[PDB]
Structures are given as C-alpha cells and as structure tokens.
C-alpha cells in the first residue's frame with residue numbers, strides 16, 4: 263500500500279558525493295512519485311535531475327543511456343542486478359503485514375517441511391513468517407538466492423533458485439498467479455499462494471496451465487518460419503542463445519530470423535508475419551502478455567520441442583541465470 | 584520485374600563481403616522484412632538481424648543494431664547524419680506527378696512558383712519545374728541542408744527547402760501537415776497537389792493555428808512542466824531542454840527534464856506534470872495532441888505560455 267524510499271539517504275548521498283547531475287529510474291507503479299522526488303532533490307541539493315521516461319520492468323531493465331549521462335542513477339523498486347559503475351539501487355520495500363495471510367495458508371499445508379518464497383518488496387518479512395510456521399509445529403526453510411535474485415526467499419518471473427531447497431511444499435507470499443505458478447512448475451511441488459492484501463490463500467495447481475499450453479504450442483508444430491526475439495535491455499539480452507536457436511531451426515529444416523528490439527510488444531511483432539515466435543527476452547512475456555499475440559510465442563525449450571530437437575514434455579520455466 | 588532495392592542491397596553485401604547484415608524498416612514496410620531477409624540469406628553468405636523497434640525517419644537510426652552488424656540497411660527515408668555503416672534505401676515512388684502539377688496550375692495566382700515535396704517524389708521535381716515554366720511561370724527548387732538533403736525536400740521538422748525567393752508554392756504529395764508547415768513558416772500561399780488522387784487544394788493554416796491556440800490556452804495555467812527529450816539518433820535536443828528549464832524558472836514556473844526513447848501518451852500519463860514541452864520529433868506534438876492526457880507544447884509555444892514570445896508570432900518547430 264505504501265513503499266519506503268530512502269529519501270533522506272538519497273539527499274545525503276547527493277550532497278556527500280557533490281553530485282551535479284542525478285538520474286532517476288522508476289518501475290511503472292512508482293513513476294507517480296518521480297516529480298515529487300525530483301522536486302526534493304532540486305530544492306534541497308544543488309544537483310539537477312533527469313527522470314527516465316521509458317517503461318522499466320525490473321533490475322533487468324537499467325536505463326544505461328541515462329546512467330552514462332549522469333553522476334549517479336538511482337533505480338527504485340527493485341533489488342540490484344548486475345554490477346554498474348554509478349547505479350544505486352533503492353529497495354522500496356513494502357510495509358504491508360504478511361503474517362495474517364501466512365496464518366490463513368496454514369490450514370492448506372499437508373507436508374511438514376515448508377518453504378517460503380516472495381518477491382523483493384516482502385523479503386525482509388520472511389524471517390518472522392518462518393518463526394510463525396515453526397511455532398505451528400512445521401519445519402520452515404527460506405532458500406538462498408543466486409547472483410540474479412540476491413535475497414533469500416526471493417523469486418522473479420525468470421528465476422526460481424530460491425525455491426530449489428530441501429522442502430516438500432511452498433507458501434508463496436504476494437499477489438498474482440504467475441509467480442506461484444512458476445514455482446509449482448519449476449519444483450513439481452505443491453504451492454499455496456497467500457495474498458497479503460486480500461488475506462486469502464489458494465492452492466495454485468499447474469496441470470491446467472501446462473495442459474492447455476501444451477495443446478496450443480502444437481499449433482507451432484506446423485510453423486515453417488520463426489521470428490527469434492532478442493531484447494537489448496540490460497538484463498534480458500540473450501543473443502548467443504538466439505543464434506543457437508537459429509542454427510537448430512536450420513538443422514531441422516526450418517528457418518528462424520533474429521529480431522532485435524528494446525520493448526517486445528504485439529504491435530511490433532504483428533508486422534513481421536512470421537508463423538510463430540520464440541522469445542529470448544523477458545520470459546514472463548511468453549506466458550502472460552502472449553495470450554493476445556496473434557501467433558504463438560514459445561519459450562526456447564518449447565521451440566526445441568516443436569523442432570524435434572528435444573522430446574516432448576510439459577513446459578519448463580524459462581529461467582535467466 | 585527488376586527489384587531495384589534488392590539488387591543494390593545484394594551488390595553492396597557482395598562488394599563489402601558482409602557476413603552480418605542489419606535491416607531497419609518504418610511501420611508500413613516491416614511486412615517486407617522477412618522476405619528481404621530470406622533473399623539476402625539465400626543469395627549471400629550473410630546472416631541477417633531485423634530491427635523490431637518502431638522507426639519513424641532517418642532521425643531514428645537503430646544505432647545499437649548498427650553497432651552489432653557489418654552494414655545496416657535503413658529503408659524508406661533519405662539519409663541524414665554521418666553513420667559509417669548505415670546505407671539508406673530511400674524506396675522512392677514511381678507515380679507520375681505531372682497530372683497533379685497541371686491540376687495545381689489552375690489554382691495559382693502568382694508568377695514565381697516554388698516546388699517542395701517529400702523523399703517519395705524528389706527525383707521528379709526537375710521535370711515538374713520544366714512543365715511549370717513551359718506553361719508561363721517561373722519556377723524555383725530550394726536547396727535543402729544537412730538534414731533534408733535533396734533539393735525541394737521538406738520534413739515535418741525542416742522547411743529549409745521552402746526558404747527561397749518565390750511568391751507561391753506547389754507541394755507535391757499526400758497529407759496536409761507538410762504544406763501547412765510551409766504556409767506557416769513562409770507566410771506564403773501553398774497549393775497541395777496529391778499525385779495519387781490527382782487533385783489540388785489550397786491549404787489554410789487557420790484551423791491548424793486555432794487548434795494549437797487551444798492547447799496553449801490550457802497550458803497557460805500549468806505550474807509544473809515535463810520537458811521531454813528523446814534519445815533517438817536525430818531527435819536529441821538536451822541543450823534546448825536545459826535552456827527551456829532555465830526560462831521556466833525565470834518566469835516563476837518549474838520544468839523537469841524527462842529523457843526517453845519513444846514518446847507516448849501512456850508514458851506521459853505516468854508522471855504528475857500539469858503540461859509537457861516536447862523537444863523530440865515535432866510531429867508528435869501535432870499528430871498525437873488529442874490522445875495526450877495533458878497539453879503538449881512545442882518549444883516556441885512554451886515560450887508563448889511563459890511570456891517570451893508573442894502569441895501571434897507562431898513558428899514551426901524545426902530541427903536545425
């Protein structure tokens with residue numbers, strides 16, 4: 263409901279480092295605060311501000327052109343990714359209480375070893391949730407992150423490393439269906455989604471999602487020409503994979519053309535009129551935004567299946583690691 | 584039968600022994616992209632990468648793609664800039680413009696006529712000039728500049744070719760923005776001659792200026808402005824943006840610089856400014872005016888709002 267910007271710390275950093283030019287980058291939900299924050303910086307420091315106006319979907323999406331034009335770029339809403347010279351990551355952790363939703367999920371647990379995952383805006387609250395589940399008699403573990411998702415318990419739409427742990431079931435804390443869906447697909451374990459805003463908890467089963475999707479990607483079985491999508495965004499670029507996929511298509515008597523872009527949208531893909539697309543950019547596009555693409559959009563593994571390169575199986579999660 | 588663009592592209596690839604080729608197309612030509620890629624990969628040893636971003640003009644080179652390939656072929660626009668490995672395939676129209684020119688002669692009231700057009704028809708202006716002179720007029724074709732390279736060529740952001748000694752203009756092409764721009768920039772009468780429909784009409788900037796007046800009026804009460812800068816290769820005007828911010832403060836207003844690639848209504852809605860000043864493509868300001876959710880002004884209109892320009896002293900926003 264509210265988010266914590268480290269504003270007094272940002273001002274100190276600017277005044278301490280004597281920055282004269284300061285960049286600001288916000289995910290879409292936080293752009294509503296950009297002008298207010300610019301105002302504070304310009305009124306209380308001698309720096310002048312440039313706000314990034316582009317969509318920003320994550321720490322995978324750094325405005326590197328802006329960073330190369332300022333002394334420091336403050337990037338909000340996301341946990342840091344990569345290692346950039348002058349980019350400072352401002353967490354913006356959420357203050358919503360997750361304990362009621364966790365207790366709500368307790369009566370959906372079957373096993374005794376429970377794992378917890380969440381997104382970055384709640385990772386600071388997992389410790390007290392783990393205490394609650396251990397007080398209810400269960401064992402609880404919070405899996406460690408990797409270089410892409412640094413915080414224990416943190417998952418992304420493209421990274422489920424925190425869910426690779428010695429437990430039997432998971433509780434996902436947060437909103438939406440795609441994160442717990444991905445965890446259930448990645449681990450093949452039971453996942454309860456506990457929404458802290460609604461204080462409701464539901465089992466997220468992947469069988470429906472895998473089954474309907476499998477039947478649909480078989481539409482691409484008959485595709486002859488593929489567009490292989492590559493994004494230039496700072497943390498989504500997979501050109502070497504795209505060139506491997508193009509070679510595998512040719513090996514199997516089909517054709518892929520590499521299409522290089524920044525934003526991946528249906529409007530820009532409709533114009534090319536390939537039979538189907540393979541997405542090497544943000545993998546959440548493939549399973550969410552793709553529902554209203556006019557041609558099939560496949561993960562790299564799904565592409566290999568349609569080609570005959572690998573044997574059929576339900577969709578695995580396309581991870582970036 | 585002879586594809587002129589494709590044969591030139593293949594010969595260029597063969598001569599320069601390119602192994603990695605980029606293709607960049609504007610919106611209406613992307614439907615040819617895979618077919619051209621297929622020909623290149625079939626008939627040369629090159630691998631092709633297609634730009635998937637929107638492309639609005641030669642002001643909008645995919646420089647990331649250019650730095651990823653041996654040669655980038657950019658379609659639909661006359662060149663601008665000095666990119667070492669970008670080849671411009673102008674994709675010119677072959678329609679006979681002479682019938683529209685003769686139709687425009689009916690509406691002329693002066694003896695000394697200037698000719699302007701877009702890249703589509705620039706190779707046909709010499710013939711049109713010859714026809715206008717043999718029907719009793721004087722005719723001149725103004726020279727362009729480093730941005731609108733061909734004689735008589737105008738862009739939505741460049742009317743240099745219309746700054747020439749004449750009394751009246753014939754614009755050859757479709758759409759009315761360019762001849763309106765010429766009429767406003769020169770204060771001369773402009774006849775617009777559409778060669779596809781073969782018709783000619785006088786353009787009147789009256790409705791256009793009245794519409795711009797409405798956006799100026801709304802922004803007059805704005806306290807906080809977003810000043811838009813684009814990173815596109817030929818649209819970047821950060822120094823202008825910084826000047827406009829200073830003039831805003833001089834006049835008791837506030838402007839914040841916002842740097843972006845694409846300029847869209849959805850992206851401006853996200854920010855809490857009262858109004859915006861656009862230093863990127865000036866056609867954004869006009870074309871999308873009705874879809875923006877706050878007034879979007881040209882730099883000159885911003886000057887009017889702040890009290891630095893007379894409201895009657897409207898000028899076209901040009902990239903020079």
Ligand SMILES: Nc1ncnc2c1ncn2[C@@H]1O[C@H](CSCC[C@H](N)C(=O)O)[C@@H](O)[C@H]1O
Pocket residue numbers: 319320381417418419420493495498524525526527543544546547550551
């Ligand atoms: N290259 C790209 N082009 C267009 N949209 C993108 C994109 N990358 C991400 N997105 C958008 O951002 C959404 C993911 S954002 C929410 C996921 C979050 N980053 C996480 O991993 O936890 C996608 O559904 C898509 O709508």
Ligand SMILES: Nc1ncnc2c1ncn2[C@@H]1O[C@H](CSCC[C@H](N)C(=O)O)[C@@H](O)[C@H]1O
Pocket residue numbers: 639640641701737738739740813815818844845846847863864866867870871
């Ligand atoms: N940076 C940008 N972001 C979004 N749209 C842009 C843009 N630059 C140009 N456009 C789009 O492209 C349109 C101009 S297209 C016709 C202009 C042509 N290049 C000429 O000069 O003759 C604008 O109306 C706008 O809708």
Ligand code: SF4
Pocket residue numbers: 319320321322323418419420421497498543544545546582
């Ligand atoms: S799921 Fe997409 S938007 Fe989220 S971090 Fe991964 S690549 Fe970025």
Ligand code: SF4
Pocket residue numbers: 639640641642643738739740741817818863864865866902
């Ligand atoms: S009018 Fe806009 S799109 Fe056309 S050349 Fe000028 S800046 Fe580019």
